């Protein structure tokens, strides 16, 4: 249970790798993965059509049944649902989509719910077709989130920026 291994250590509680967030989980068993999410909880493709067909559909079924009796997230919510044979539960995190007009400063609101585990394997909140800017992203999650968050980046390209802007 949470085994990771071959992260590069950006802050006594951050850590980042070039990796299929999936793969990591598979690898790693972690307590808690964090999808990416939208507040219907609908898995049509990036970090949540990976891990919803790694399930096999599960996830997406669970999902169905969440949202029937819950009603929506909201951008900067979450809730931890299973996490199937990914990890002991996957906690759905809606960031803000900045190409559809959400407010960027929700992205700290989002990235304040990974402070409710001791330890999570996670993707970069915002990032890929929400919109945001990728390094301002990692800024958020290094002010915001205390406990121990291991990112899964699936980029070496967006990997590497990201480190070297991190060590100016
Ligand atoms: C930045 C990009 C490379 C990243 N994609 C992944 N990261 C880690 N593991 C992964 C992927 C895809 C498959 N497996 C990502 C980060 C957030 C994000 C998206 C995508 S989009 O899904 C939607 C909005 O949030």
Known sequence: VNSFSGYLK???????????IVEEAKKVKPTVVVNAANVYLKHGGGVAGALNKATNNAMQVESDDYIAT??????????????????????????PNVNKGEDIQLLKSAYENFNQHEVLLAPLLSAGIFGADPIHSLRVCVDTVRTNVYLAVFDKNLYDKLVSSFLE
């Open 70 to 95: 819950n009603g929506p997230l909201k951008v900067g919510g979450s809730c931890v649902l299973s996490g199937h044979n990914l990890a002991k539960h996957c906690l759905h995190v809606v960031g």
């Open 10 to 20: 950006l802050t006594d509680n951050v850590y980042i790798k070039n990796a299929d």
